[PDB]
Design a protein around this ligand. Structure first.
Ligand SMILES: *[C@@H]1O[C@H](CO)[C@@H](O[C@@H]2O[C@H](CO)[C@@H](O)[C@H](O)[C@H]2NC(C)=O)[C@H](O)[C@H]1NC(C)=O
Ligand SMILES: *[C@@H]1O[C@H](CO)[C@@H](O[C@@H]2O[C@H](CO)[C@@H](O)[C@H](O)[C@H]2NC(C)=O)[C@H](O)[C@H]1NC(C)=O
Ligand SMILES: *[C@@H]1O[C@H](CO)[C@@H](O)[C@H](O)[C@H]1NC(C)=O
Ligand SMILES: *[C@@H]1O[C@H](CO)[C@@H](O)[C@H](O)[C@H]1NC(C)=O
Ligand SMILES: *[C@@H]1O[C@H](CO)[C@@H](O)[C@H](O)[C@H]1NC(C)=O
Ligand SMILES: *[C@@H]1O[C@H](CO)[C@@H](O)[C@H](O)[C@H]1NC(C)=O
Ligand SMILES: *[C@@H]1O[C@H](CO)[C@@H](O)[C@H](O)[C@H]1NC(C)=O
Ligand SMILES: *[C@@H]1O[C@H](CO)[C@@H](O)[C@H](O)[C@H]1NC(C)=O
Ligand SMILES: *[C@@H]1O[C@H](CO)[C@@H](O)[C@H](O)[C@H]1NC(C)=O
Lengths: 361, 99, 251, 120, 49, 50, 99
């Protein structure tokens, strides 16, 4: 009170000095059931992968993507991102994801990179310089390789011009190594562009087949259908907690509600358009949001010439949420309630007054 | 309409509080009226500007509310002083003042 | 497969009064015993809505979507099955298809080749609404929404790339025109489509026993930006509304 | 509850203190207004049990014993006919005490004339 | 008459409604003041000729 | 920077002038009451109770 | 505060910038007063075989405070699996050299 009044002597009376706040104890985030998962099982772990000249593009949209399972898998030998962070994939949202799946040689795994020049980069799969997303690669010697030689995986070796980003070329035009005219007939200097790999189990690291899946993100004006996973925690009631229900956040006490919502309604508002009722997304139940017991802290004291005893009034605050007496004005701490009636000396409110004789109310 | 003066005072106070509360839903030129959305969607260098816009708008709303409350308080104080004069002169005695 | 229908009878389109229909819930927020003023795309009260018949009448034209579409259906025997949404209605652009067949409702956003005269046919054994489907971006299968006995109200909106479908089923016994009353439309489904739509077309079903059109009637109204004052009762349903721009009393 | 907002709000100084102090002044002014209007007597007078006033009837303005609120029928009718950091402080005088003050004033003006306003 | 200005002004809320309400209150208050001062009789008295 | 200081100080000064005018109205009402008491209690005998 | 950075990173040595060296190498406060000086040093700070003496913190758990220096040569754990001070799968050195 001396600090508030900027004086070392306080006259007799009641002085509003502070503002009591019920501090939030827990954070409760309730988000609905994590269903309609993105089909990453059929892209990373498909039966047969595609070649690099005809890489399979799968569009991931209208689903929630759990990048934590993909990132925490230890089978992947390469997880390099060029426009985002690996630890922030579960937090960000994107419009759609393009998954480019192919198989390449072990030495060419580095060639799927922005600014990198190689045969795969120039003629098979090209990335832009401002590429966003992540490249994932893993060894597939146990599955793709065959003892007789796996010739199913072809790759383009020659083309007149370099590829544009995200461009496929499945054409089988005969390349002209020299300047001789070739009308589709092979010759001394005219060869077929697609050559087969030599994947065999006896080769060491560098010639083994590596399966590469490249995820590219789009952030166009379309709605962000693709989002990270939502970790819903448990629901705690009857306490002043920070609630985050389906993106609507705030602080309040969540109690049981007798209000019967219609099935399409999620939140509830009073006359003043403040959210006082809500529906839990996990379990379809209605909860009232009572605001936390904020109040004004007033100090009731006589003159410092007389005594240094003080009483604290928490305005509009119940005594269970803070010589403790409950009044309609609020909770009064430090004053002994008496049944006698005297004249009002220091006004408290709701017919309650305080006086010094100790401090009585 | 017998008790219109008291109902007018109650309605004016309720409407004033309502207008104050509804001023929180206005962004005042910022991207959003919610501080949490600004803090979650933007970095602190631009969130500081947006929060500053919300702060000045809400502060102007609160000053407007306090000013009109003070003017209404002066009017109610004048009416209460008149009521105290009527209590002293009409109830506690007989008044020769016409009307 | 496409078939030209060349047995139509020429008749001018009809018009009728909207009365106090077309109100929908602006949001997913419960409100109890309170009056809420909202500014949104709403259908004007007592407006002039275009009336189309199916009786030899087979009304399936293409109309401009504008900012929203209010579809009223005085329906018996489930002739009306779906809608056609798009800009050019061909393979050049991307179009939205809403269909309700005998089992479920399918919502697709794809590059379809629409027929000039798309229809279904009734046992349902005739589907002639498209010839090709090249590039699909969005598919959504849901639960089926569905004297004239049924009244079906729908509101379609394209706001911020979101397609809002509001709907209401009403049991009526009026023979010809729209009944006079109040029924607020619940929000049914929000679609993340993110595409341009400027034109629409109703999809009907033929009856085979040439072809015969079952008895049905529908109404098209257009959504305009305006303010409504909605009344919410104790149970939280909208029981009455006021159009702020209709007459000075409601203003 | 935003800490960044409060940190930015501290740049504007003691505006919040002025708003709180002005509202506190209004709040104490309302109690002072009620005190000036109704608390004009320091003796709580009561009417006699026998309402023999020479034919004059004051039942509609005297407090009703049947009602728990101890209000007059006219006062009961008057009370029936009147229907984010925000707090509403209760008035210093409750409705029961204001009714008690009006009852004391009515008892004084009925039993004692204008003498109670000028002395004993 | 700028529609863009009105669109930006709607972001500030109901300030305009408050100002119009206050001015309307003052305007009716002036008529109430004149009514209170001068209209204290309900009969129009006339002097003798 | 000067513009930010000007708008803040101008808002503070307008607020101070506003409460000064309200307090001036209150003091003017009290002074009018005091003038009425001087005219009716000191310069004459008043039959008004209290 | 003296350091050597890239040509495109000179915009990130400023108050209120979002960037990589801004977050994990050198952070300026929002209320920073002073001057940033940048000049080209290709003639002195470059070698034909590659000058790798200048290193930046590629990996860190959190963004730095203003006027905070991190010289700790501890390994970074990028995944769920602990690294135990040894490089391996999802275990990378935080300091990488400019070429
Ligand atoms: C049904 O009638 C329409 C209207 O004429 C036909 O659409 C035209 O078909 C021809 C066929 O080559 C095209 O050249 C025209 O460009 C089409 N018109 C438009 C506006 O695109 C439609 O083909 C007919 N259906 C069938 C099955 O023949
Ligand atoms: C004073 O007035 C009251 C009310 O006018 C009288 O109470 C009425 O008494 C009659 C007959 O006893 C009843 O039929 C009415 O219903 C009463 N009205 C009410 C409102 O109570 C009362 O009798 C009068 N006289 C005295 C001495 O109190
Ligand atoms: C195959 O990959 C998918 C990717 O989501 C994963 O969920 C699945 O568990 C994997 N299967 C095996 C046998 O590793
Ligand atoms: C979601 O999960 C909860 C888990 O308790 C389950 O009870 C509920 O039926 C699920 N579905 C919906 C629509 O809430
Ligand atoms: C509706 O429009 C038609 C033609 O556009 C017109 O003939 C009719 O009178 C209109 N109805 C009303 C009620 O305005
Ligand atoms: C939508 O399409 C119409 C015509 O089909 C065109 O005039 C309009 O510009 C388009 N709008 C957008 C945002 O593409
Ligand atoms: C309804 O449409 C869906 C989607 O094409 C299809 O799978 C289903 O078989 C159809 N049902 C009937 C009865 O034709
Ligand atoms: C759309 O389809 C055509 C042919 O059906 C194809 O050439 C084109 O690449 C497709 N575009 C997209 C974006 O899928
Ligand atoms: C509200 O619901 C109750 C059932 O709880 C019902 O008795 C009452 O009639 C309903 N009122 C309205 C106006 O719908």
């Amino acid at each position: 009170t001396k600090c508030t009044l900027k004086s070392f002597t306080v006259e007799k009376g009641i002085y509003q000095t502070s503002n009591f706040r019920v501090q939030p104890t827990e954070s409760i985030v309730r988000f609905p059931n994590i269903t309609n998962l993105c089909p990453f099982g059929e892209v990373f772990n498909a039966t047969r992968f595609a070649s690099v000249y005809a890489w399979n593009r799968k569009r991931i949209s209208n689903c929630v993507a759990d990048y934590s399972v993909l990132y925490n898998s230890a089978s992947f030998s390469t997880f390099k991102c060029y426009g985002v962070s690996p630890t922030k994939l579960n937090d960000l949202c994107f419009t759609n994801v393009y998954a480019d799946s192919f198989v390449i040689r072990g030495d060419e795994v580095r060639q799927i990179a922005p600014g990198q020049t190689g045969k795969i980069a120039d003629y098979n799969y090209k990335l832009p310089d401002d590429f966003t997303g992540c490249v994932i690669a893993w060894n597939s010697n146990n599955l793709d390789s065959k003892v007789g030689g796996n010739y199913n995986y072809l790759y383009r070796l020659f083309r007149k011009s370099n590829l544009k980003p995200f461009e496929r070329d499945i054409s089988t035009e005969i390349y002209q190594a020299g300047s001789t005219p070739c009308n589709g007939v092979e010759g001394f200097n005219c060869y077929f562009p697609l050559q087969s790999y030599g994947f065999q189990p006896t080769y060491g690291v560098g010639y083994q087949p590596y399966r590469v899946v490249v995820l590219s993100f789009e952030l166009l004006h379309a709605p962000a259908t693709v989002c990270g996973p939502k970790k819903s925690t448990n629901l705690v009631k009857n306490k002043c907690v920070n609630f985050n229900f389906n993106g609507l956040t705030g602080t309040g006490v969540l109690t049981e509600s007798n209000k019967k919502f219609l099935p399409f309604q999620q939140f509830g508002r009073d006359i003043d358009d403040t959210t006082d009722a809500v529906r839990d997304p996990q379990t379809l139940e209605i909860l009232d949001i009572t605001p936390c017991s904020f109040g004004g802290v007033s100090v009731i004291t006589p003159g410092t010439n007389t005594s240094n005893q003080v009483a604290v009034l928490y305005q509009g605050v119940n005594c269970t949420e803070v010589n403790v007496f409950q009044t309609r004005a609020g909770c009064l701490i430090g004053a002994e309630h008496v049944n006698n009636s005297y004249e009002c000396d220091i006004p408290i409110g709701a017919g309650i007054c305080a006086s010094y004789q100790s401090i009585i109310a | 309409s017998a008790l219109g003066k008291l109902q007018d005072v109650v309605n004016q106070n309720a409407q004033a509080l309502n207008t104050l509360v509804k001023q929180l839903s206005s962004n005042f030129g910022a991207i959003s009226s919610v501080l949490n959305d600004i803090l979650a969607r933007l970095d602190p260098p631009e969130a500081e500007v947006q929060i500053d816009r919300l702060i000045t708008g809400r502060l102007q709303s609160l000053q407007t509310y306090v000013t009109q409350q003070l003017i209404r308080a002066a009017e109610i104080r004048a009416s209460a002083n008149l009521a105290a004069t009527k209590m002293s002169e009409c109830v506690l005695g007989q008044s020769k003042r016409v009307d | 497969q496409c078939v030209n229908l060349t047995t139509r009878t020429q008749l001018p389109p009809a018009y009728t009064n909207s009365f106090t229909r077309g109100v929908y819930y602006p949001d997913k927020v419960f409100r109890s015993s309170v009056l809420h003023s909202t500014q949104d795309l709403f259908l004007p009260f007592f407006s002039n809505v275009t009336w189309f018949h199916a009786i030899k009448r087979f009304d399936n034209p293409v109309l401009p979507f504008n900012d929203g579409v209010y579809f009223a259906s005085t329906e018996k025997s489930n002739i009306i099955r779906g809608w056609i949404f798009g800009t050019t209605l061909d393979s050049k652009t991307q179009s939205l298809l809403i269909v309700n067949n005998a089992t479920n409702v399918v919502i697709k956003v794809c590059e379809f080749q629409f027929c000039n005269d798309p229809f279904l046919g009734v046992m349902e054994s005739e589907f002639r609404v498209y010839s090709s489907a090249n590039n699909c971006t969005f598919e959504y299968v849901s639960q089926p929404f569905l004297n004239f006995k049924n009244l079906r109200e729908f509101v379609f909106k394209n706001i911020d790339g979101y397609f809002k479908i509001y709907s209401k089923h009403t049991p009526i016994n009026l023979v010809r025109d729209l009944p006079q009353g109040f029924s607020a439309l619940e929000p049914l489904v929000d679609l993340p489509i993110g595409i341009n739509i400027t034109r629409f077309q109703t999809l009907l079903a033929l009856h085979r026993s040439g072809w015969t059109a079952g008895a049905a009637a529908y109404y098209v109204g257009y959504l305009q930006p305006r303010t409504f004052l909605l009344k919410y009762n104790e149970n939280g349903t909208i029981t009455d509304a006021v159009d702020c721009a209709l007459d000075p009393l409601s203003e | 509850d935003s800490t960044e907002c409060s940190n930015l709000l501290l740049q504007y100084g003691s505006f919040c203190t002025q708003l709180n102090r002005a509202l506190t002044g209004i709040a104490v002014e309302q109690d002072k207004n009620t005190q000036e209007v109704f608390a004009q007597v320091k003796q709580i007078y009561k009417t006699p049990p026998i309402k023999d006033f020479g034919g004059f009837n004051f039942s509609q303005i005297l407090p009703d014993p049947s009602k728990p609120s101890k209000r007059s029928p006219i006062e009961d009718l008057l009370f029936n006919k009147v229907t984010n950091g925000l707090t509403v402080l209760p008035p210093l005088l409750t409705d029961e005490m204001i009714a008690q003050y009006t009852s004391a004033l009515l008892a004084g003006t009925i039993t004692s004339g204008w003498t109670f306003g000028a002395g004993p």
